[PDB]
Structures are given as structure tokens and as C-alpha cells.
Design a protein around this ligand. Sequence first.
Ligand SMILES: [Cl-]
Length: 201
Amino acid sequence: MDIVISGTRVIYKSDQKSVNVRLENKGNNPLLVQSWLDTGDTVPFTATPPVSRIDAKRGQTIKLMYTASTSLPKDRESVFWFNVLEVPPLLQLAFRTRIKLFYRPDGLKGNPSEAPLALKWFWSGSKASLRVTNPTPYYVSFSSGDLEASGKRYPIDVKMIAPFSDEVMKVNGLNGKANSAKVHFYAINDFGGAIEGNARL
Ligand SMILES: [Cl-]
């Protein structure tokens, strides 16, 4: 992919009339580029310009705008996908990249960077897995995580966990519950940086 998005996620605070996302063409040829929002494969947003020509080594700011055509919840975050599809101007190959957009109503309890600490973790029985509960109004997203017991480490197939919900996450290479296990993880903050955390099962 020649088109690069500035940032690995977008935060859309509800009091903003719009939010900008920047695209850059790092490649050597110009590209036709489409930008849009969807729910992850209708959506109360526009992205403009929806189609642009971005020359080599030049860029384009995309304006994302909430339309309230549908009302989003005001008591929790909502997540969307910001998509970018490039194609060089017969038959032709093209490429698509997506990053998350979190719609964040103003005034939610607590802070999003603290939501990973608030997660509760449980063994999920029998093919080991964990049940994880998010008591907060924020998504929690991870870059990686693992379970450790008796000096052995087992990667977790981490998944994003929605506000006020449970998710089960698989533990790789572990048959069943281990004694005195601990979870360690790196969640992702608004700026794409790491939030380290841990929990004892
Ligand atoms: Cl992510």
C-alpha cells in the first residue's frame, strides 16, 4: 500500500462538527483513492472528498462528519471502520486499508486509558480460553497479551472488547486451566501507544 493513513485509529468526540484524517501517497505514481466509513463488513457519517487523486509524494486531508441520520448511543462508545482504497489510474489491481474510528459521546464515566485496568478476567472452561468482562463505556483494544503459569507463557488471541460486554479469547498451546496463572497484556490508547496491564486468575 502506497497510501498511508496518519494514525492507527481516529477518535471522534461527539461535540465535534467534524474530524480530519490525513492521507499521504508515499509511492512514485499518482493514485485514485476512495475514503469511506462503514461498520466493518447505515452509517451516520460522511467522508469528503470520497474520491481523490493523490499525486506521488503528495497528500489529502479527509474530513469525517457525523450526520446523526441515525442516532448513536450516548452512554458508550460506538466503533466504525475508516476505509481507504487505492487504485492506479483493461484489468487492474487495487489495495484497501482500514483503521478504527471510535465515536465517543462527551461525559462518559472514567477515562479510556484506564478501561483496560477495569477489565475482569476469568478462566473459561474447559482447549483453554479466558472470559473477559468490560464494565466500562469504552472499547478496549489490544496489540498482544499472554497467560503465564509456572514459567511458561501462552499467547492470547486478543480481541477488541466492546463497552459493557463480555468476550472469550483463546489461549494458544494450553490444554486446560493452569494453577496460579497471570494475564499480561498491552492495550492500545487513543494515540496508538501501549497501555500495559496484568491480572491474576
Ligand atoms: Cl487497533
